[PDB]
């Protein structure tokens, strides 16, 4: 195995914390520039949720690649490459809630 | 066409219709196949 950027999990965690800092400070600027109607707390909660989604990763290379992708997304947001549609896609506003209980899935459709 | 008439076929239309979009004669798509699955018809007697 050849390390992408970090030879051990602790170094990757350090990189992840740096990326989280960058996003946390960028969130208010994003709300201001993109004229988003979400609050800063809401965007930072979404940032935490996106970070938490991949909290199960235990391999340093996967974490490093995830940090790279997050940095690319942050660069997109810091510039105006991503539009308000792209920024608000993280909040699935249009999509209706999907029930997760067995009975609701049984009622709604054949999907497992 | 006057010098060289087209071949005469029965199925060929005798009256040419212009584009009928935006008119009551506009084509409306629909399925041309019958229902695939037939459901059970419950009995009409109480029991």
């Amino acid at each position: 195995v050849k390390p992408i950027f970090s030879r051990d999990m602790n170094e990757a965690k350090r990189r992840v914390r740096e990326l989280y800092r960058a996003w946390y400070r960028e969130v208010p600027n994003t709300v201001h520039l993109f004229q988003l109607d979400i609050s800063v707390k809401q965007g930072r909660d979404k940032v935490r949720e996106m970070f938490m989604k991949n909290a199960h990763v235990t391999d340093p290379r996967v974490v490093d690649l995830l940090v790279i992708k997050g940095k690319m997304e942050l660069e997109e947001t810091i510039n105006v490459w991503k539009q308000r549609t792209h920024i608000m896609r993280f909040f699935h506003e249009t999509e209706a809630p999907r029930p997760t209980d067995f009975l609701s899935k049984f009622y709604v459709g054949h999907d497992p | 066409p006057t010098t060289k008439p087209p071949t005469a076929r029965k199925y060929i239309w005798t009256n040419h219709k212009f584009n009928v979009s935006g008119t009551p004669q506009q084509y409306v798509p629909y399925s041309t196949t019958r229902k695939k699955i037939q459901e059970w018809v419950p009995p009409s007697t109480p029991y």
């Binding site: 989604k53 235990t58 391999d59 996967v62 992708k69 459709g109 054949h110 999907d111 497992p112 | 629909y30």
Partner: protein
Amino acid sequence: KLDITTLTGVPEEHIKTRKVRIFVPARNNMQSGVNNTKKWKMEFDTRERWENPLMGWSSTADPLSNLVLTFSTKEDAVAFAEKNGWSFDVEERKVPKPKSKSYGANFSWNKRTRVSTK
């Protein structure tokens, strides 16, 4: 313990709720050819298909309905499924068992293999 699930970009529902079948496709009984039975195939579980109201065309919401992958060996397909975090079921290859064929048996003196017509 390789996991590319986070990096693939597949939504969680398909990662978790989908069962992938690893198999060697059986020969189409209509044909005697066996060339299409030489490579392992990975196919996802079938999902709902409904008729479009306008035209009756079969509509689907399963992104992986048509996704089929070819693997040289069973182990490689299993490795791919494990790396992508799909639950997998492996059906062992079915090979035609060797048979004993004799043209002479068609004209046996005492056995029942004699053929009434040629």
